[PDB]
């Protein structure tokens, strides 16, 4: 063994030690992918959630920490309309956070189509989706009014009765309780049409200004990891 060979082996051992150090850090941080629309409020979340916890750039990274657990969120910007190619780079991610506006009736069908496209993608057949019905304050304001009618855009509304399993907060009119579970019903009906039991969709109701979304993401990710561990450790 020449001196050069010994030096090369020593360098390889040092690099291997550093890589082993980095592996533990890598397998302690969970990656989340954020999707939405321009009319949505994903900017509001990424602004007033990381505070409490270059011109042409594609990926924006947000780091937050809940109960000493690290989370990295990735927002996609400056890209084109096509998504069939860069969506496959996200296969080992923990969850996809879909933020949908619940007040604009004009752009609800497009949101449903986008959710259907993400749900039935070939490369995303094992990734769960956390759904955020954002800006519920405006839905209440518009519902308790006359210059609007949700029955106009969707003709199936005047056949819907509120589900028995509901938890209306005190001080909410019955009207705002009915025109609010219909949207979740549509999204979950799209979810349960296919997918078998490999992946699930978690619904939530969220306002623009609130500090609970980190807790909700933590709970959903914990459930996802629990299900993966049940599959892995030979229980189901």
């Amino acid at each position: 063994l020449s001196a050069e060979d010994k030096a090369a082996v020593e360098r390889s051992k040092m690099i291997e030690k550093q890589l082993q150090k980095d592996k533990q850090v890598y397998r302690a941080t969970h990656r989340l992918l954020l999707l939405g629309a321009d009319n949505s409020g994903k900017s509001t979340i990424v602004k007033q959630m990381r505070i409490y916890h270059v011109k042409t750039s594609g990926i924006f990274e947000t780091k937050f920490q809940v109960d000493k657990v690290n989370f990295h969120m990735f927002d996609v910007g400056a890209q084109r309309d096509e998504r069939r190619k860069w969506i496959q780079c996200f296969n080992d991610v923990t969850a996809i956070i879909f933020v949908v506006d619940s007040s604009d009736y004009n752009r609800l069908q497009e949101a449903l189509n986008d959710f259907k496209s993400i749900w039935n993608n070939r490369w995303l057949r094992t990734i769960s989706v956390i759904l955020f019905l954002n800006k519920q304050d405006l839905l209440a304001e518009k519902v308790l009014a006359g210059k609007s009618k949700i029955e106009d855009y969707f003709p199936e509304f005047a056949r819907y009765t509120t589900p028995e399993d509901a938890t209306p907060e005190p001080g909410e009119d019955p009207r705002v309780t009915r025109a609010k579970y219909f949207i979740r019903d549509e999204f979950l009906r799209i979810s349960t049409a296919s997918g078998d039991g490999r992946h699930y969709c978690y619904p939530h109701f969220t306002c623009s200004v609130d500090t609970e979304n980190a807790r909700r993401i933590f709970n959903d990710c914990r459930d996802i990891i629990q299900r993966m561990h049940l599959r892995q450790y030979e229980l189901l």
Binding site: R27, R222, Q232, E234, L235
Partner: protein, 286 residues
């Protein structure tokens, strides 16, 4: 000086021994292959499954000598040794299996009830360390049981293998410590881990109604089959050790103790089925 009769010992033993051998050799070999497949793809259970299967094979390989002992009328022909070896693999090799069962239970509990914490306790190196500790306990117990010369002759010249009827003074303490350590600690650990797993799975959201009733069936089946395999043996062991020594009493419960010992041999058939066959991963590679 107490020829005990052993009509039963010569009637039901051969059928059980031959059935266990035939059913449990290929089953354990296939379980070993599955354990290889798991350990290749960076899974911590693979170490435990492989070690459990190896312990089961070690137990199984000892039956043919016992089978020839049973076939023959009270006689043990091979040598003046290997009775202090096959005796170990028949009487004290059933606890490596329970140790690895408890290891699997704790691994499952830390995987499904605290998924965000204890990442360093579920790696391959920790599994190798605990496996080596369990096998070192096996080796120390095995360097025990050899300071005592244990072969006696019968009134009708025969050779009994690893049993003394009027229980000896030195065996009572072994019986007591065996009962406590091997059947009050492992059972408490199993119950306290599986209750936690069931609570965690019933508090979940993404699992459909059907699968929680399934996991429940598997968990109760595992615990119940373990109990039915082991509990009567230990109960009869205490019954003999505490206040059942006088030779007349001894002649009385020979059936009970040997029936319990014969029943405790089904672990080698139960373990590969419950830990290597009823799993979607095992059905996806066959």
């Amino acid at each position: 000086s107490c020829t005990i009769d052993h009509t039963i010992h010569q009637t039901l033993a051969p059928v059980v021994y031959v059935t266990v051998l035939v059913v449990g050799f290929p089953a354990n070999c296939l379980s070993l292959y599955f354990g290889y497949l798991q350990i290749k793809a960076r899974n911590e259970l693979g170490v435990y499954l492989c070690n459990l299967t190896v312990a089961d094979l070690f137990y199984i390989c000892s039956l043919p000598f016992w089978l020839q002992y049973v076939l023959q009328h009270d006689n043990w022909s091979h040598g003046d040794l290997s009775c202090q070896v096959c005796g170990i693999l028949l009487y004290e090799n059933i606890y490596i299996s329970v140790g690895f069962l408890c290891c699997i239970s704790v691994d499952r509990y830390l995987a499904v009830a605290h998924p965000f914490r204890f990442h360093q306790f579920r790696t391959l190196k920790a599994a190798v360390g605990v496996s080596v500790v369990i096998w070192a306990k096996e080796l120390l117990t095995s360097i025990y049981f050899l300071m005592h010369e244990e072969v006696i002759e019968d009134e009708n010249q025969h050779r009994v293998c690893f049993e003394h009827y009027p229980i000896q003074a030195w065996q009572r303490a072994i019986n007591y410590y065996r009962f406590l350590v091997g059947f009050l600690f492992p059972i408490c650990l199993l119950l306290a881990s599986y209750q936690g797993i069931l609570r965690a799975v019933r508090r979940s959201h993404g699992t459909q109604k059907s699968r929680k009733d399934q996991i429940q069936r598997l968990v109760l089946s595992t615990v119940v089959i373990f109990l039915a395999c082991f509990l009567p043996y230990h109960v009869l062991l205490l019954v003999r050790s505490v206040w059942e020594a006088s030779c007349d009493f001894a002649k009385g419960v020979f059936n009970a103790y040997h029936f319990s010992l014969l029943l405790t041999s089904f672990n080698c058939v139960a373990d590969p089925v419950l830990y290597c066959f009823v799993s979607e991963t095992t059905h996806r590679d066959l």
